């Protein structure tokens, strides 16, 4: 059933699983027309498909051309997500195919179940977790490949960089969700925290800066502080 606080360690066991987040698939800017009506303009989007154990990210870029001449795009976006996830699974060798796919939004369950009918032994699950994967497009290098795409493209990343050399999957996921929660709550402040010291850089082959173990503790503390501050403002508490 649903993935929650109770069954959290299941994410880091040896059964292959993927999270799928569809919140950045269909993206628009809302604007005024010459006549003073409102219209949308689609921008490039992405499916965020993540192995929480390995950090392997399957970023399927959704080019605006897929929406051309289609109706009910927010509905279509869920089905297009399920179509591409199904295509990704079929593209993987059998021993790399997930045993579970966890969708971050309940509206993805039926579309993904119907597209995966050929895979009855792959469990499609919702989650009670409020995961901050919507903030993926606050990671500069992910935002850059999505916006520059001129056609449908899959790009593979490791969202943990080289962290698993030093820390467990559980700890790497916790760091990732804290970084993304901070970027979601106050992007400007989170990005300031991450780049404030010019001597710590991002390797060409990485997404995040090359912090020492001690620097990660300072960074993680600064991210927690950012999140609590923001929360006190949101709620006046």
């Amino acid at each position: 059933g649903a993935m929650n606080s109770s069954n959290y360690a299941e994410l880091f066991n040896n059964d292959i699983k993927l999270f799928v987040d569809d919140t950045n698939v269909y993206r628009v800017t809302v604007h005024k027309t010459f006549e003073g009506n409102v219209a949308t303009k689609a921008i490039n989007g992405c499916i965020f498909t993540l192995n929480p154990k390995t950090g392997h990210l399957f970023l399927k870029i959704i080019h605006t051309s897929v929406w051309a001449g289609q109706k009910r795009l927010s509905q279509l976006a869920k089905w297009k997500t399920a179509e591409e996830v199904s295509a990704l699974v079929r593209s993987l060798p059998k021993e790399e195919q997930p045993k579970q796919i966890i969708v971050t939004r309940k509206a993805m369950l039926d579309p993904l179940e119907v597209h995966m009918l050929d895979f009855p032994n792959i469990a499609i699950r919702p989650t009670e977790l409020r995961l901050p994967f919507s903030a993926a497009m606050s990671i500069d290098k992910l935002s850059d490949v999505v916006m520059k795409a001129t056609e449908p493209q899959m790009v593979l990343f490791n969202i943990y960089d080289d962290w698993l050399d030093r820390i467990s999957s559980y700890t790497a996921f916790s760091r990732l969700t804290l970084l993304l929660r901070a970027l979601k709550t106050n992007e400007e402040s989170a990005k300031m925290i991450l780049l404030s010291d010019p001597t710590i850089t991002i390797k060409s082959y990485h997404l995040w800066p090359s912090f020492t173990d001690e620097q990660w503790i300072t960074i993680e503390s600064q991210m927690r502080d950012l999140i609590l501050t923001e929360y006190g403002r949101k709620y006046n508490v």
């Binding site: 509905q75 579309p111 119907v114």
Partner: protein, 300 residues
């Protein structure tokens, strides 16, 4: 006008014949039901006074043979049997009629209710849903599970309704996932109507049989089947006009007949709200929408 005689009534029982019902007392000199209209299937059904659990009964058609009821004190139920001796049977019925030991099927001349509930129901189709090929009549009860309920456990005692599953390879063409899920027309028209049922009359017959088993026996699997067959039509953008008009009449009489006090357990809120207010056919079931809104506005 045909007759189903009873050998006796040794246990107190409520006896149903179609939409009618009569209380019979323990050892009451009751010897059966006469003046049964020829041309329809019928159901004769029982609920014992001492165990109001297990409603059970028999679907039959008096054109197919001479049927009677006899209590079995070993199995503890009223059983239908066929009398193969025409002259013995005619002589039993004539004696019981002369002694006026029989209730008369109480049909009002103006009243098309039973025809309207059984219009497409055919004994030969019932006998394929309820498999007991040595009898010309079919036993159903409250507890019998469906082939579909059994997949999700004695196969000989199952209701073999046509399996309908909206999230199945049968329902969804590879490459038309979204189209086939949101518009079930290919599943309704190609798979079910052209493929399995062959025509709308056989589809309606099974829908009507499912409803009657739900109503008369509280058979939960039957209720599921009735709603699935309604939802499959209402969820199709493309349905022949004659089928929608006929479905409105079918459902109207079913909703009209349902006991008011059983709407809570026999009507699925989600399906009826979806069918009447959200579905492609939300505006195609005028009679059904009006009777549902006037009789069960709470459910909606």
């Amino acid at each position: 006008m045909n007759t189903v005689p009873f050998t006796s009534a040794p246990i107190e029982v409520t006896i149903g014949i179609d939409q009618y019902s009569f209380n019979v007392k323990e050892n009451q000199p009751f010897h059966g039901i006469k003046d049964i209209p020829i041309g329809h299937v019928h159901v004769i059904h029982f609920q014992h006074a001492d165990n109001s659990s297990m409603r059970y009964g028999y679907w039959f058609d008096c054109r197919m043979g001479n049927f009677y009821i006899q209590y079995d004190p070993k199995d503890g139920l009223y059983k239908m049997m066929e009398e193969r001796d025409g002259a013995k049977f005619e002589n039993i019925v004539h004696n019981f009629k002369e002694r006026q030991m029989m209730v008369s099927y109480p049909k009002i001349d103006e009243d098309d209710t039973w025809y309207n509930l059984t219009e497409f129901v055919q004994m030969d189709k019932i006998r394929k849903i309820v498999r007991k090929d040595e009898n010309q009549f079919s036993y159903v009860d409250s507890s019998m599970t469906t082939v579909q309920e059994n997949e999700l456990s004695d196969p000989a005692h199952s209701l073999n309704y046509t399996v309908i599953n909206f999230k199945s390879r049968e329902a969804i063409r590879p490459g038309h996932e979204m189209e086939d899920f949101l518009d079930k027309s290919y599943y309704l028209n190609t798979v079910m109507l052209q493929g399995i049922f062959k025509n709308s009359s056989n589809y309606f017959g099974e829908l009507q049989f499912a409803f009657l088993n739900a109503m008369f026996f509280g058979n939960y699997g039957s209720s599921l089947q009735w709603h699935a067959m309604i939802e499959l039509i209402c969820s199709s953008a493309t349905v022949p006009k004659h089928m929608l008009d006929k479905l409105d009449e079918i459902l109207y009489y079913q909703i009209k007949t349902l006991p008011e006090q059983y709407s809570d357990i026999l009507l699925n809120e989600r399906v009826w709200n979806i069918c009447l207010y959200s579905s492609f056919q939300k505006n195609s079931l005028h009679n059904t929408e009006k009777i549902m809104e006037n009789k069960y506005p709470e459910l909606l």
